[PDB]
Amino acid sequence: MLPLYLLTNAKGQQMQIELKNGEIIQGILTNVDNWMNLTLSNVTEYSEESAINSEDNAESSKAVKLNEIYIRGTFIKFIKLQDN
């Protein structure tokens, strides 16, 4: 429950979540539960493949925007937290 606890302090903050399949979800954490399920707002979704390819700009920025998303904790691989 270490991850659940730290995240509940990160509510309101932006983050980059990568899923087990390589999908990246960047958004504002609005809620977390005991099993580490997440709801984010202001979300933009893309792949690691697309984020890496847009490094020296090619085929710029193929992404998708969502108002809200629910993510299953057990499907999370890792979470990049804001530098602060």
């Binding site: 429950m1 270490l2 390819n53 890792f78 979470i79 990049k80 937290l81 804001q82 530098d83």
Partner: protein
């Protein structure tokens, strides 16, 4: 079911299930091997061509089931082999690495399909790219 939350500070490498190597500072972990890393770096090696690549990743929270192995490292010592190596851009290296992963996966689905025709199941996990 108490959480044993260890506060530490070590320089480590982490190998993930997807095959990536991270270097960073481990600050926190629990008994499930959930980790909080500081000043992370993703590093890719191709010793077969004397080339490597780095890119900064910052603060990483990693879920423990995605870990293969980790271990304390001496950063300065691991630099030295790099000094004799040619650093390439991360995008180029990542693309090379994705090319190699693709090859493995297609060889493994091919093996699974052939062995099935002989009745053998090659139970195979798409997630195990390490």
């Amino acid at each position: 079911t108490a959480a044993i939350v260890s506060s530490v500070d070590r320089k480590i490498f982490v190998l993930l299930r997807d095959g990536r190597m991270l270097f960073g500072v481990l600050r926190t972990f629990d008994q499930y091997a959930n980790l909080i890393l500081q000043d992370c770096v993703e590093r890719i090696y191709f010793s077969e061509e004397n080339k490597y690549a780095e890119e900064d990743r910052g603060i990483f929270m990693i879920r423990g089931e995605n870990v293969v192995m980790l271990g304390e490292v001496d950063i300065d010592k691991e630099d030295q082999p790099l000094e004799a190596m040619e650093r390439i851009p991360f995008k180029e290296a990542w693309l090379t690495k994705q090319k190699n992963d693709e090859k493995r996966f297609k060889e493994e689905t091919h093996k699974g399909k052939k062995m099935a025709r002989h009745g053998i199941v090659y139970d195979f996990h798409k997630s195990d790219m390490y």
